[PDB]
Amino acid sequence: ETLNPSARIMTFYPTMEEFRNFSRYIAYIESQGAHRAGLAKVVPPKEWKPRASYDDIDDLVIPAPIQQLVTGQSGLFTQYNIQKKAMTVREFRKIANSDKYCTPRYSEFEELERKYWKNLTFNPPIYGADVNGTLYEKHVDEWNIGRLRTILDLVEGVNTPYLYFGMWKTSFAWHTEDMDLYSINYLHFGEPKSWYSVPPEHGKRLERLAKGFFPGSAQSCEAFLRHKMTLISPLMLKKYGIPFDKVTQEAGEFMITFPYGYHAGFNHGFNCAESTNFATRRWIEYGKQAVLCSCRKMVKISMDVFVRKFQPERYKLWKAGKDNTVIDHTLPTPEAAEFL
Ligand SMILES: [Zn+2]
Numbered sequence: 001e002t003l004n005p006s007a008r009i010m011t012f013y014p015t016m017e018e019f020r021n022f023s024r025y026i027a028y029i030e031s032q033g034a035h036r037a038g039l040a041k042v043v044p045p046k047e048w049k050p051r052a053s054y055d056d057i058d059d060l061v062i063p064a065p066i067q068q069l070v071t072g073q074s075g076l077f078t079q080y081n082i083q084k085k086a087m088t089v090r091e092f093r094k095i096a097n098s099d100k101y102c103t104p105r106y107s108e109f110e111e112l113e114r115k116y117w118k119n120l121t122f123n124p125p126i127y128g129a130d131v132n133g134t135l136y137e138k139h140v141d142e143w144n145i146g147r148l149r150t151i152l153d154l155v156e157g158v159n160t161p162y163l164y165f166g167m168w169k170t171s172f173a174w175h176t177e178d179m180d181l182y183s184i185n186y187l188h189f190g191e192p193k194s195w196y197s198v199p200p201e202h203g204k205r206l207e208r209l210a211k212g213f214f215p216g217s218a219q220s221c222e223a224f225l226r227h228k229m230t231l232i233s234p235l236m237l238k239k240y241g242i243p244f245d246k247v248t249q250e251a252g253e254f255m256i257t258f259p260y261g262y263h264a265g266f267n268h269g270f271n272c273a274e275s276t277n278f279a280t281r282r283w284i285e286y287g288k289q290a291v292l293c294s295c296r297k298m299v300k301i302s303m304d305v306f307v308r309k310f311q312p313e314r315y316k317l318w319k320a321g322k323d324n325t326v327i328d329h330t331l332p333t334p335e336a337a338e339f340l
């Protein structure tokens with residue numbers, strides 16, 4: 001409650017010594033209340049690089065590029081995907097940097113943000129999303145998205161790294177992570193990626209708003225936002241009193257999403273991001289209480305293993321369906337104890 005009361009997006013600058021232990025740093029940023037915003041930025045030490053050069057990836061295959069068709073008006077939009085045939089990074093880059101798809105000329109972000117919400121339904125861009133793989137070198141032990149060594153490893157999908165090749169106007173709709181997990185996003189290179197976040201304590205208010213605007217979608221599926229098709233502009237969130245914050249992620253910076261932190265955003269132009277999910281001991285309760293997509297046959301993790309290992313006291317009580325536990329969104333992870 002006292003740590004980060006404003007629930008604003010916090011930016012962190014760890015030293016090389018702070019940065020070497022990933023799981024410890026997550027506990028540290030939570031003791032600082034970063035989780036309250038639902039999104040945090042981590043700028044790594046200048047000496048740190050996950051790869052020496054991004055020169056040898058032209059022939060990397062993007063198995064399923066998606067053309068994003070957006071329909072909507074007055075801040076409310078639905079994004080439909082059209083899967084295209086496999087393309088390489090070289091071909092994707094040519095299309096991203098071409099006169100048809102390149103970033104418009106602008107001065108400040110506010111102008112580019114305006115151009116985004118004004119033009120998101122025109123000239124459908126291509127998103128080189130959900131590419132199985134990593135751009136990290138094998139010797140990189142610090143913050144390796146391919147091997148974070150968190151408690152989520154107990155599961156083995158959701159623990160594997162994904163690549164996202166963006167172009168101007170490519171977007172990610174309002175959503176929380178699968179099983180309401182944490183996510184790590186590293187911007188390898190290229191143009192920025194802008195982000196919007198709703199604090200987890202206000203997450204239910206966003207759902208409430210989304211249900212009112214898409215009632216057909218709300219009846220068919222209780223967790224329709226997990227379809228990742230719903231785009232709601234910041235001006236629409238302001239109109240209906242939803243608290244949110246924005247941040248721009250530049251190349252070489254990490255973004256951390258927290259359990260039940262709703263986020264959306266867009267790519268400024270040609271770029272590449274690496275993403276995976278992870279957990280801490282705080283996530284277990286969110287996983288047990290997560291409202292999952294019913295209509296699609298989706299990412300569902302059996303919580304038994306986590307409850308039997310970290311909550312043995314509550315395991316039989318939870319298996320009977322008696323655990324009436326109410327999640328406190330403001331509370332940091334138990335691992336943060338050393339920083340308090
Ligand atoms: Zn996400």
Ligand SMILES: [Zn+2]
Nearest residue numbers: 221293294295
């Ligand atoms: Zn569904």
